[PDB]
C-alpha cells in the first residue's frame, strides 16, 4: 500500500535532482554565478532524499528500528542538516535576486564567482554546526522518564527534545529566513509595479498579474510546505499532551514533499528546457 507511494516519492526526488545536476555540468552555457546556488540546493536535496526518506519510510513501515543507536543518531543529524540547509539556500537565492533587480549598475561588482563559493561554504558550515555538534554530543537530551527509557533501549530512538534546542533550531532554520524573503519580495514587487506604470503613460494612447502569479507560487509552495511543522514544533514543547505523535510525523513528512517541487519552480527557463531535451 504505502510502500508504492514511498517508492514513487523517492524516485521523484532522486530523478529531478540528478537530472538538474547532470544538465548544469553537461552545458557550459547553463553554468552561471547564479546557478551555483541552484546546484548546491539540488545536491543538498539529493542527499536528503537518498539519506533520510528511505530509512524513515522503512522505520515507519516495520514499526521497529533494527539498527544501532549510533546509526539512528547519525540519521537524525543528517536529517536536521539537510532540512536546515534546504532553506537558507532559498534565502540566498532571494537575496541575489534582490541585489540583481534593485542594483543594476553594481550587480557585476558585488557578486563574483569567487564570492559565491565563500557564501556556499559559509552557509553549509552554519547548517552543519547546529546539526552535528549538538546532536553527536548529548546537549539535546531530555529528562522525563519516557525519553530516558527509550534512549536506554537499543530498539527505539524517537525525537525527544528540550525547550532550548527546540526553540533555537526552529529560530535558526525557519523564522529567520522568512522575514528576509518577505521584505525582498515586497521590494521586488514594488519595483516591478513602478516600472509597468512608466510604460503605460508613454504608450497608453497607442494601446499586472504575472508578478502576482510568480511571487504567489514561489512563496506559497514553501510556506504551505514548511509552515505548520515549525509551529507545532514549538507548540508541543511549550506544552505537553497537546500534539499527537502521529500528527507530528504526518506534518514532518508533508514537509519532506517540498523536495520534488524545487526543480519544477527554479528550473523553468527555456535554456533549461533546451538542455533537458538534449539529455
Amino acid at each position: 500500500g504505502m510502500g508504492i507511494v514511498m517508492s514513487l516519492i523517492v524516485l521523484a526526488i532522486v530523478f529531478g535532482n540528478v537530472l538538474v545536476i547532470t544538465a548544469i555540468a553537461k552545458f557550459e552555457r547553463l553554468q552561471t554565478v547564479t546557478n551555483y546556488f541552484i546546484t548546491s540546493l539540488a545536491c543538498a536535496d539529493l542527499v536528503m532524499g537518498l539519506a533520510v526518506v528511505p530509512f524513515g519510510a522503512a522505520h515507519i513501515l516495520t514499526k521497529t528500528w533494527t539498527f544501532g543507536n549510533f546509526w539512528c543518531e547519525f540519521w537524525t543529524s543528517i536529517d536536521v542538516l539537510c532540512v536546515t540547509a534546504s532553506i537558507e539556500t532559498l534565502c540566498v537565492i532571494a537575496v541575489d535576486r534582490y541585489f540583481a533587480i534593485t542594483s543594476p549598475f553594481k550587480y557585476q561588482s558585488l557578486l563574483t564567482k569567487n564570492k559565491a563559493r565563500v557564501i556556499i561554504l559559509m552557509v553549509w558550515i552554519v547548517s552543519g554546526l547546529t546539526s552535528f555538534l549538538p546532536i553527536q554530543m548529548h546537549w539535546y537530551r531530555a529528562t522525563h522518564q519516557e525519553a530516558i527509557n527509550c534512549y536506554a533501549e537499543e530498539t527505539c530512538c524517537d525525537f525527544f527534545t528540550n525547550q532550548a534546542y527546540a526553540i533555537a533550531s526552529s529560530i535558526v532554520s525557519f523564522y529567520v529566513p522568512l522575514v528576509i524573503m518577505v521584505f525582498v519580495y515586497s521590494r521586488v514587487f514594488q519595483e516591478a509595479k513602478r516600472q509597468l506604470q512608466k510604460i503605460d503613460k508613454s504608450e497608453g494612447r497607442f494601446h499586472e498579474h504575472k508578478a502576482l502569479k510568480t511571487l504567489g507560487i514561489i512563496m506559497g509552495t514553501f510556506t504551505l510546505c514548511w509552515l505548520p511543522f515549525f509551529i507545532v514544533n514549538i507548540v508541543h514543547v511549550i506544552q505537553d499532551n497537546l500534539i499527537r505523535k502521529e500528527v507530528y510525523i504526518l506534518l514532518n513528512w508533508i514537509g519532506y514533499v517540498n523536495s520534488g517541487f524545487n526543480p519544477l519552480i527554479y528550473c523553468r527557463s527555456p535554456d533549461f528546457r533546451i538542455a533537458f531535451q538534449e539529455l
Binding site: I101, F105, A192, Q195, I199, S202, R205, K210
Partner: protein, 225 residues
C-alpha cells in the same frame, strides 16, 4: 625541459593579465551614436565632450563608452548586436527642406533589423526652437507635406508659454515615430525626448534610461514583467 616551465610561467602571467582586464571589460557600458546628416550630432557630443571617433565619460562612478558612426546600406552593423543602447538623433524642424520621411524610413529599417532584435533605441528630437520659429507666423504648413495632420487632435505635460500649435506639431512628430516603435514584442522599447542642442541636462538623460533598460531586462529575465 626548461622550455615547458618557461611556457607555463608565460601562460600564468597571461592569465593573470586577462583576469585583471576582465573586470574593467565587464564594468564599462557601450553605446552607439547614429544620426542622420545635418541633424546636429556634433553639437550634442562636443558640448557634452566636457566630462570612428571614440569618447569615454563617467557618471556617478560608472564607466560609459560611446562610438560615433563615421553608406546607403550598412553591413558593418552586425558587429553592434551587444551594445547596451542605440542613440538616434534627428532634426525635428526639417519637415520641409523630404528629409523627415527619409529619417522615418531609416528608423523603420533600423528597428526591424535582424541583428538588432533586442536593442533599445533612445530618441533625441533636436532643433526644438527652429521648429517653433517655423510654426509660429510661418507660411509653410505641415498639412501640405503631411496629409495625415488634418485629422489629428491634441493628446490630453506642456511647459508654460507655448501656443497649442507647437504642442500639436511636436506631439504629432513624436507619434509618427512611436507608431513605428510600438506596432512591431516588448523585448525593446523607445524613449522619446525633446532636446535643444545647447541643453546641459542631456548627459543625465542617458544615465537614467540606461538604468531603466538594464532594470527592465533583469525583470524580464526572471519572468516578472
Amino acid at each position: 625541459r626548461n622550455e615547458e616551465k618557461a611556457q607555463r610561467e608565460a601562460n600564468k602571467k597571461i592569465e593573470k593579465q586577462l583576469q585583471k582586464d576582465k573586470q574593467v571589460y565587464r564594468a564599462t557600458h557601450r553605446l552607439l551614436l547614429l544620426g542622420a546628416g545635418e541633424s546636429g550630432k556634433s553639437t550634442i557630443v562636443k558640448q557634452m565632450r566636457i566630462l570612428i571617433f571614440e569618447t569615454k565619460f563617467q557618471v556617478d562612478k560608472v564607466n560609459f563608452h560611446m562610438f560615433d558612426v563615421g553608406d546607403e546600406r550598412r553591413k558593418w552593423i552586425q558587429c553592434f548586436n551587444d551594445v547596451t543602447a542605440i542613440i538616434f538623433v534627428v532634426a525635428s524642424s526639417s519637415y520641409n527642406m523630404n528629409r523627415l520621411q527619409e529619417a522615418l524610413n531609416l528608423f523603420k529599417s533600423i528597428w526591424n533589423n535582424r541583428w538588432l532584435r533586442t536593442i533599445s533605441v533612445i530618441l533625441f528630437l533636436n532643433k526644438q526652437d527652429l521648429l517653433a520659429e517655423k510654426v509660429l507666423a510661418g507660411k509653410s504648413k505641415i498639412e501640405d507635406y503631411f496629409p495625415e495632420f488634418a485629422r489629428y487632435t491634441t493628446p490630453e505635460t506642456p511647459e508654460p508659454g507655448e501656443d497649442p500649435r507647437v504642442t500639436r506639431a511636436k506631439y504629432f512628430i513624436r507619434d509618427e515615430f512611436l507608431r513605428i516603435s510600438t506596432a512591431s514584442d516588448g523585448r525593446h522599447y523607445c524613449y522619446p525626448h525633446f532636446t535643444c542642442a545647447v541643453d546641459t541636462e542631456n548627459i543625465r538623460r542617458v544615465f537614467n534610461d540606461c538604468r531603466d533598460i538594464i532594470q527592465r531586462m533583469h525583470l524580464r529575465q526572471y519572468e516578472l514583467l
